[PDB]
């Protein structure tokens, strides 16, 4: 599908939402060294501006 290569950190922006409930995917949930990928079902809005002209 249409995958937008959005280079981000911490927050995943403009990504594909999960259907039904939110999903918690991890290679090893009992492992702290492996990152925890979270996928929302309802998108949250964030407005960023650079007021400097």
């Amino acid at each position, epitope marked *: 599908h249409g995958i937008k290569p959005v280079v981000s950190t911490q927050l995943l922006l403009n990504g594909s939402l999960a259907e039904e409930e939110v999903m918690i995917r991890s290679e090893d949930i*009992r*492992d*702290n*060294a492996k990152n925890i990928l979270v996928q929302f079902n309802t998108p949250v809005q964030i407005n960023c501006t650079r007021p400097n002209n």
Partner: antibody
Amino acid sequence: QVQLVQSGAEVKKPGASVKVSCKASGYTFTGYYMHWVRQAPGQGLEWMGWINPNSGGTNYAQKFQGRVTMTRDTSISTAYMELSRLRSDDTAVYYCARRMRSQDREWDFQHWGQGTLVTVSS
Amino acid sequence: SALTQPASVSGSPGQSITISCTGTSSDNYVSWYQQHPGKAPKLMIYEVSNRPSGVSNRFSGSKSGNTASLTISGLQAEDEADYYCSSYEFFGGGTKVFVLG
């Protein structure tokens, strides 16, 4: 021929802080996380936290959450471990471990340093 | 310290020995370290049974339920160190090998 060289023995007063060096050689420094495990004299090993030399992101244990600060210098391939506000129980031998090159990553420490002995004596 | 290790395990030079490591839950990997006094630990067994190069085949590992065990067949005078079992970030109490008088 993975080479791990730490700093010499340090002596600090209780309440001060100390920074422990850990120089790596013989592999790609920015490809392996760097762990820190201490052992009190006559006791067992205790994992403190790992640091990713790539981005610098660490993972301090809850016991030392707010006391230890792990940094690195990718130019010289040296990881650092600083413990603030030293208590009486902080006297231990502090090692910096590294994962196996083979077999996945991170939790099978094949390479260890010679150890750094920091002590609190009042 | 969720991993339970006996403080002392007995064995004679030549015969086998076994060090038990009892840890709760069953869904992980167990590792073993050998720490001689004055030196750093040495990875002897990774992933329950596998063994890194190049430690002798006299060391072998096993796991059944909530109990992992390290076995050393044919004990020598150089097998004298502290043995710890590892699970993720946790460590065991340690085990001293007593050879023979």
